Swiss-Prot record:
This is Bromodomain-containing protein 4. Interacts with p53/TP53; the interaction is direct. Interacts (via CTD region) with CDK9 and CCNT1, acting as an associated component of P-TEFb complex. Interacts with RELA (when acetylated at 'Lys-310'). Interacts (via NET domain) with NSD3, CHD4, BICRA and ATAD5. The interaction with BICRA bridges BRD4 to the GBAF complex. Interacts (via NET domain) with JMJD6 (via JmjC and N-terminal domains); the interaction is stronger in presence of ssRNA and recruits JMJD6 on distal enhancers. Interacts with NSD3. Interacts with NIPBL. (Microbial infection) Interacts with bovine papillomavirus type 1 regulatory protein E2. This interactions may serve for the tethering of viral genomes to host mitotic chromosomes allowing successful partitioning of the viral genome during cell division. The record marks N98 as: Acetylated histone binding. There is a cross-link at K57 (Glycyl lysine isopeptide (Lys-Gly) (interchain with G-Cter in SUMO2)). The chain holds residues 44 to 168 of 1362 of the full protein. It comes from Homo sapiens (Human). The gene is BRD4.
Amino acid sequence: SMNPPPPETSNPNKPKRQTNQLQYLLRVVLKTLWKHQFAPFQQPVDAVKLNLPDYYKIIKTPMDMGTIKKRLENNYYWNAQECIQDFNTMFTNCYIYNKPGDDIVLMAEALEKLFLQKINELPTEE
Ligand SMILES: COc1cccc2onc(N)c12
């Protein structure tokens, strides 16, 4: 029923990097998805406000674009794959929790279509 602590966006002992691929994930990937008409995914799922008391019983690896945005802006990642995994976790969580055909599923699908289109053109490491 209650909301858990949000995913980590700051960890000073975690080693960090500022790479061209990570810059692409913020400037191109996150920015395209964030501006979209279907961008429920801009903050962690509020199970209390949205009345989803079983959400966190089912979803054990929560992820959202608000967390991803903070992670990219505060240079939390070491590599592009960590960020790509976060986006994939967010889409997977939506498909696992929600029933097939739901509005929220179609919203995640539209964002995922653009995500795959952008990741297809991930630049080579400089
Ligand atoms: C408004 O967001 C929702 C409403 C209902 C179910 C949901 O699952 N994942 C979400 N982001 C979500």
